[PDB]
Design an enzyme around this catalytic site. Sequence first.
Site, short mmCIF file in Angstrom:
data_model
loop_
_atom_site.label_atom_id
_atom_site.label_comp_id
_atom_site.label_asym_id
_atom_site.label_seq_id
_atom_site.Cartn_x
_atom_site.Cartn_y
_atom_site.Cartn_z
N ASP A 25 -19.32 6.96 -12.34
CA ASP A 25 -19.61 5.97 -11.30
C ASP A 25 -19.86 6.66 -9.97
O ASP A 25 -18.93 6.91 -9.19
CB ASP A 25 -18.44 4.99 -11.20
CG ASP A 25 -18.69 3.83 -10.26
OD1 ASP A 25 -19.77 3.76 -9.61
OD2 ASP A 25 -17.79 2.98 -10.17
N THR A 26 -21.14 6.95 -9.71
CA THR A 26 -21.52 7.62 -8.47
C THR A 26 -21.28 6.75 -7.22
O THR A 26 -21.22 7.27 -6.10
CB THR A 26 -22.99 8.07 -8.51
OG1 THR A 26 -23.85 6.94 -8.73
CG2 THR A 26 -23.21 9.13 -9.61
N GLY A 27 -21.15 5.44 -7.41
CA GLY A 27 -20.83 4.52 -6.32
C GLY A 27 -19.34 4.36 -6.04
O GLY A 27 -18.95 3.52 -5.24
C1 LIG Z 1 -14.88 2.37 -1.86
C2 LIG Z 1 -15.21 2.62 -3.32
O1 LIG Z 1 -15.66 3.72 -3.64
N1 LIG Z 1 -14.98 1.66 -4.22
C3 LIG Z 1 -15.26 1.81 -5.65
C4 LIG Z 1 -13.97 1.80 -6.47
C5 LIG Z 1 -16.20 0.69 -6.07
O2 LIG Z 1 -15.79 -0.47 -6.16
N2 LIG Z 1 -17.47 1.04 -6.33
C6 LIG Z 1 -18.51 0.08 -6.72
C7 LIG Z 1 -19.59 0.14 -5.62
C8 LIG Z 1 -18.99 -0.24 -4.27
C9 LIG Z 1 -18.65 0.74 -3.34
C10 LIG Z 1 -18.09 0.39 -2.11
C11 LIG Z 1 -17.86 -0.94 -1.80
C12 LIG Z 1 -18.19 -1.92 -2.72
C13 LIG Z 1 -18.74 -1.57 -3.95
C14 LIG Z 1 -19.05 0.45 -8.11
O3 LIG Z 1 -19.76 1.69 -8.06
C15 LIG Z 1 -19.96 -0.66 -8.70
N3 LIG Z 1 -19.10 -1.80 -9.11
C16 LIG Z 1 -18.85 -1.92 -10.58
C17 LIG Z 1 -17.43 -1.46 -10.87
C18 LIG Z 1 -17.10 -0.77 -11.99
C19 LIG Z 1 -15.72 -0.47 -11.94
C20 LIG Z 1 -15.12 -0.93 -10.84
S1 LIG Z 1 -16.15 -1.74 -9.81
S2 LIG Z 1 -19.46 -3.23 -8.42
O4 LIG Z 1 -18.24 -3.95 -8.50
O5 LIG Z 1 -19.76 -2.96 -7.05
C21 LIG Z 1 -20.66 -4.11 -9.11
C22 LIG Z 1 -20.37 -5.22 -9.92
C23 LIG Z 1 -21.38 -5.99 -10.52
F1 LIG Z 1 -21.10 -7.05 -11.31
C24 LIG Z 1 -22.72 -5.66 -10.33
F2 LIG Z 1 -23.68 -6.41 -10.92
C25 LIG Z 1 -23.03 -4.57 -9.53
C26 LIG Z 1 -22.01 -3.81 -8.94
F3 LIG Z 1 -22.39 -2.78 -8.18
#
Ligand SMILES: CC(=O)N[C@@H](C)C(=O)N[C@@H](Cc1ccccc1)[C@H](O)CN(Cc1cccs1)S(=O)(=O)c1cc(F)c(F)cc1F
Lengths: 99, 99
Positions: A25-27
């Site tokens: 998860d690069t995000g």
């Molecule tokens: C600050 C941080 O790094 N937070 C991480 C744990 C995080 O939640 N990353 C998200 C992207 C994000 C970063 C900062 C602030 C908000 C979000 C994940 O890389 C992607 N996520 C997915 C996750 C996987 C595991 C935990 S969250 S999601 O919840 O954002 C997400 C859900 C969906 F249903 C969608 F259609 C697109 C999405 F990007």
Amino acid sequence: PQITLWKRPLVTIRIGGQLKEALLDTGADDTVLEEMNLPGKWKPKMIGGIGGFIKVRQYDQIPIEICGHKAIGTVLVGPTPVNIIGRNLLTQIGCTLNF
Amino acid sequence: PQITLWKRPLVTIRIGGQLKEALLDTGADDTVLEEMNLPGKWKPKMIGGIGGFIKVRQYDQIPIEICGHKAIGTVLVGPTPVNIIGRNLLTQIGCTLNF
Ligand SMILES: CC(=O)N[C@@H](C)C(=O)N[C@@H](Cc1ccccc1)[C@H](O)CN(Cc1cccs1)S(=O)(=O)c1cc(F)c(F)cc1F
């Protein structure tokens, strides 16, 4: 390996001796694992995501083998919808994005 | 290009008439953009991650340029704290993970 993105980049990891599936998860800044037991000291912490903030347990200096590559670093344990390997450990295993 | 993960993989995107910074996010199935009043039909959706769910509007077949690479697909618009480029568009610009 080179990993394409038509499917979720799920890999097997080995942590505290147990095998689990986790999402590369690069995000994510940090590595967050679903509720589990880990040995040693931890500290309460909070992290934010798309839906708001959660409480996690922060374990420092934890060995994890991610897709055959060794890392040792911070693992957060808490109510994530899926196990995620974040940038803190993706950097350790030499992972980059390419296009 | 190659993008290391020491910092958030933020890149410049263009959608509508607007330039924005967005996360190249392998942990996101779908692309989620900060609130913007795009033209055209949409449908309501709920998407979930750490912290819970947010309400978004799903727009289809929206052109988007990411680092000068053209893409076209579904974008979810809503109160996300960060612009997220998900796998639905990452594949279109030829993005892989490599280690
Ligand atoms: C600050 C941080 O790094 N937070 C991480 C744990 C995080 O939640 N990353 C998200 C992207 C994000 C970063 C900062 C602030 C908000 C979000 C994940 O890389 C992607 N996520 C997915 C996750 C996987 C595991 C935990 S969250 S999601 O919840 O954002 C997400 C859900 C969906 F249903 C969608 F259609 C697109 C999405 F990007």
